[PDB]
Amino acid sequence: SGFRKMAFPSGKVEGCMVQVTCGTTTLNGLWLDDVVYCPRHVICTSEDMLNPNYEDLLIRKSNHNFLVQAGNVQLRVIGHSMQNCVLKLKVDTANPKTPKYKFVRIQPGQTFSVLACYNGSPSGVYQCAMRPNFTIKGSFLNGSCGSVGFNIDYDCVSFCYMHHMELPTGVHAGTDLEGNFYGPFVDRQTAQAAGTDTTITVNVLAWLYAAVINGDRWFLNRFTTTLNDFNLVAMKYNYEPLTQDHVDILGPLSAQTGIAVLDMCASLKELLQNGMNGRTILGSALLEDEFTPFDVVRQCS
Amino acid sequence: SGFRKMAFPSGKVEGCMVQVTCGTTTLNGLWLDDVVYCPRHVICTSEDMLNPNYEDLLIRKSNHNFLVQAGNVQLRVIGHSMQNCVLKLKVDTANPKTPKYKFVRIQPGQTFSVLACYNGSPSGVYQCAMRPNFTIKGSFLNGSCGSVGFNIDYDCVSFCYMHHMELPTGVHAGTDLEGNFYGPFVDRQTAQAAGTDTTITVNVLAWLYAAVINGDRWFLNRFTTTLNDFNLVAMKYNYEPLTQDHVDILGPLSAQTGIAVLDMCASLKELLQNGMNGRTILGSALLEDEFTPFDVVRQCSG
Ligand SMILES: CC(=O)Nc1ccc2c(c1)CCCC2=O
Ligand SMILES: [Cl-]
Ligand code: NA
Ligand code: NA
């Protein structure tokens, strides 16, 4: 029993974290096989924040301008190339700790673990979700750029996020490991602002199923709803629309608990209307939206 | 910016987790130097657990009754003994991944990271606090016994918890790595229950400081209070007493934010007496008490 925001064990990623330095700037890099991946803005000076021409900045660098430190060891950079907003530094040593891995671009609502790192040394691990507005609500200080987000399938690490920047509202933006940003963001210091964020409806429903699985039924009701009426109500509370895909994805949890998906939608509608009236669900006084249907099945039973 | 419930990186502990099997029971063990540590209840059948005599059950077992698996490699058990409620299995090989480590016993209110494991394979990591009632609000399924809790100080892993059982309310009970239970619990299938819990006051205050550092300031007010006055309020709301040591420990946070501890106690007083009036603090509608002052300083500055 119990339900916790649980991260993946981070060891397989810890063994890949390195420190990348270029000029006065030091951030984190991800060492897989013989390549070190890091945000391309490591090559920016104070002059290059607003309108950097990365192609022009990069053509002026040689391999030996990039210092890569793995633990106590200096790695030799023997090549470099830019792919979208990530720099790929080819080094002369394959990482002996490279796990089985892949690069996956995730969709809003998906969760992952973040290994926050500073100077190439891991600081902490926590669980995050890709918000509907393509930001993440992380915990990152200066020097955390290049910290990565990941899931672990079985023994295979799926890298899905690399941290690039903090937006003015205190939330965070970054890329997949092919260097494509999530959302409309760019690696420039020009004013950009996250879109209005919304609640991840399918995840709240998953988490309500988790509460039922762990023995809590107080918030259920005798009602059902059509999918369209549910969406008309939920959008008035800044909830994301629930699609037929989401309804299908909740099928397994619906079958485990005996509660039809649209019946659970009716309970959610009532919770939005009533609040919790001093009660908690799985120890929270708010509706939790950073557990996916897949997370719930993995953590519960 | 941002404030998350954050665990220590678990790599140094993952390298120590093994699978221990005795009869029909498989659970997790901790492999350090040439010893595997696991709950002594691994040797009990279900009937045994009703009223175990552990020394008697253990004399009947031989080294080869303990199947220890490190990944896909079997370890050879060459000795076995008990220390309080943990079984110590001496093996033929020292763990080459043994980190620098210590066994430490933590105090209620202090936090630690739990590496939840199944069949010797780490599955998840999360942060816990030792509750005042000596339970932890973990997330564990069958097979998680022998999962461990720890802190990391520099490069040294301080092991502080090994999981043994779930109580009927769904919270969890375990021992330190010397086999001493946290709390008035026993490793036996009998009637046991968590005592009434209280809220960790110094941790709530730490988290209020974290909120202020992160720009969440609506609950601050012009008032201050005294320890004795505030502790009457804490007692009334099932909060642990605030001591002078707690005030001293929060000192750094008080100087950095300009909010003295008793000034923040006046904020907490008002929150306890009036609620949050529909607002949240660091995204929470409840007052969070599983971050210590050290956790807050480390995450907001480090
Ligand atoms: C095989 C087996 O019966 N294991 C078992 C059962 C019950 C209990 C425990 C272990 C330990 C803690 C107390 C408890 O209730
Ligand atoms: Cl006053
Ligand atoms: Na590292
Ligand atoms: Na005040």
Curated annotation (Swiss-Prot), chain B:
The active site is at residues 41, 145. It is found in: Host cytoplasm; Host Golgi apparatus; Host nucleus. Changing residue 189 to A: Does not affect ability to cleave and inactivate human TRMT1. There is a cross-link at residues 5, 90 (Glycyl lysine isopeptide (Lys-Gly) (interchain with G-Cter in ubiquitin)). It catalyses: TSAVLQ-|-SGFRK-NH2 and SGVTFQ-|-GKFKK the two peptides corresponding to the two self-cleavage sites of the SARS 3C-like proteinase are the two most reactive peptide substrates. The enzyme exhibits a strong preference for substrates containing Gln at P1 position and Leu at P2 position. Residues 1-302 are cytoplasmic. Changing residue 49 to A: Does not affect ability to cleave and inactivate human TRMT1. Changing residue 205 to V: In strain: Zeta/P.2. Residues 1-302 form the Peptidase C30 domain. Inhibited by pyridone-containing alpha-ketoamides compounds 13a and 13b. In turn, alpha-ketoamide 13b (tert-butyl (1-((S)-1-(((S)-4-(benzylamino)-3,4-dioxo-1-((S)-2-oxopyrrolidin-3-yl)butan-2-yl)amino)-3-cyclopropyl-1-oxopropan-2-yl)-2-oxo-1,2-dihydropyridin-3-yl)carbamate) inhibits SARS-CoV-2 replication in human lung cells. Inhibited ex vivo by michael acceptor inhibitor N3. Inhibited ex vivo by compound 11a and 11b. Cleaves the C-terminus of replicase polyprotein at 11 sites. Recognizes substrates containing the core sequence [ILMVF]-Q-|-[SGACN]. Cleaves and inactivates human TRMT1, preventing tRNA guanine(26)-dimethylation of tRNAs. May cleave human NLRP1 in lung epithelial cells, thereby activating the NLRP1 inflammasome pathway. May cleave human GSDMD, triggering alternative GSDME-mediated epithelial cell death upon activation of the NLRP1 inflammasome, which may enhance the release interleukins 1B, 6, 16 and 18. Also able to bind an ADP-ribose-1''-phosphate (ADRP). 3CL-PRO exists as monomer and homodimer. Only the homodimer shows catalytic activity. Interacts with host FBXO22; this interaction promotes the proteasomal degradation of nsp5. This is 3C-like proteinase nsp5. It comes from Severe acute respiratory syndrome coronavirus 2 (2019-nCoV). The gene is rep.
